[PDB]
């Protein structure tokens, strides 16, 4: 091909790292371990894919260039760019089936595969679109991603529901035992819609975002989702399955409300966990007037007991939980005080920030 460009090292490093995200180190096809490079107009585009999702980075070209395209080994090309000195100018051109990279006194010949052979996952139509700060989208995903299933046979749980309603975007994740839901207003009237994003795409989207306020433009199609921020475009196939009707698993009228400091509660559960059964992780909670007692024991008959002062006025009650599910929630909440809402020993608990309803966690108890 005719492709030629010269780009400064630091304009390539983060693009190469981002578009290499979808690559898993042991590709099934050799071209899947490659990045597609394309020069057109004054832009270099870099694309990496795993057939389910793809990451694209755009790089403006201010130095002389020639259009064309090829695919190049991702790890090797990234490692070469990163290994060159700070401020190095990286000149790239094609010589037959080889890509020549030259910088200073360094020269590299990499094997290529034709750009016409690279997969394409961009040919679809947007049906819902909106913009939001990337920090808001990062929060939505972090608040809930830990509750996604891993390799469940119910494949539609191995992912995250993204749901639009009114002016809100909501994420939902569940593994059938616990659920997380987080809702954020984005100030745009949206149609009622929901799609499932596969877990690997969710994780990769999260990793493409930082905590800035820079706008992220989201487009949702019939079978794909696309997120554009800065000079990066993430696209993922959607999961073709039906998500559970999560609104019907939220406790309807919890008559018992407990509030406690998040750190004290988390630390108490974390210590009790040490003496819980390593496989089933069950702990007992005893609630009574302004007091919570947590106990744990394990097959060796070791036992932990924690007592905490809390604000609680409901009836006395004992209920069992998988302590890892509880600690996941308390680690996900980044707040000072937590509210726990209960009904009885066989019904789920709902856990929230005591001062905010934007996130809610529903954990089903254990017989214990």
């Amino acid at each position: 091909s005719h492709m030629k460009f010269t780009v400064e090292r630091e304009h390539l490093l983060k693009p190469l790292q981002q578009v290499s995200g979808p690559l898993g180190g042991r590709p099934t096809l050799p071209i899947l371990g490659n990045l597609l490079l394309q020069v057109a107009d004054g832009t270099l585009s870099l694309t990496g894919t795993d057939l389910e999702m793809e990451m694209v980075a755009r790089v403006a070209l201010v130095q002389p260039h020639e259009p064309g395209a090829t695919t190049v080994p991702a790890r090797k090309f990234f490692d070469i760019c990163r290994g060159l000195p700070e401020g190095a100018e990286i000149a790239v051109q094609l010589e037959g089936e080889r890509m020549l990279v030259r910088s200073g006194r360094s020269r590299f010949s990499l094997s290529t595969l034709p750009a016409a052979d690279f997969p394409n996952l961009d040919d679809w139509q947007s049906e819902v679109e909106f913009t939001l700060p990337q920090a808001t989208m990062k929060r939505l995903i972090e608040a809930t991603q830990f509750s996604m299933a891993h390799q469940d046979v119910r494949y539609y749980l191995n992912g995250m529901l993204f749901e639009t309603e009114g002016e809100e975007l909501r994420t939902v994740a569940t593994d059938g035992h616990r659920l997380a839901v987080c809702s954020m207003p984005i100030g745009q009237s949206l149609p009622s819609h929901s799609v499932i994003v596969p877990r690997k795409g969710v994780i990769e989207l999260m990793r493409m975002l930082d905590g800035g306020d820079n706008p992220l433009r989201v487009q949702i199609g019939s079978n794909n989702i696309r997120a554009h921020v800065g000079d990066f475009i993430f696209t993922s196939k959607l999961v073709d399955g039906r998500f559970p009707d999560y609104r019907r698993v939220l406790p309807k009228n919890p008559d018992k409300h407990l509030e406690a400091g998040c750190d004290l509660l988390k630390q108490a559960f974390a210590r009790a966990a040490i003496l819980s059964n390593e496989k089933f992780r069950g702990v007992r909670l005893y609630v009574s007037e302004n007091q919570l007692k947590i106990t744990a024991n394990n097959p060796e008959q070791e036992e932990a007991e924690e007592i905490l002062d809390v604000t609680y006025s409901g009836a006395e009650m004992e209920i069992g939980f998988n302590v890892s599910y509880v600690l996941d929630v308390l680690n996900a909440l980044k707040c000072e005080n937590v509210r726990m809402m209960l009904t009885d020993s066989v019904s789920p608990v709902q856990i929230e920030d005591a001062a905010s309803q934007s996130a809610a966690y529903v954990v089903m108890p254990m017989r214990l």
Partner: peptide, 5 residues
């Protein structure tokens, strides 16, 4: 462990 659904 009990089921949510």
């Amino acid at each position: 462990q009990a089921d949510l659904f």
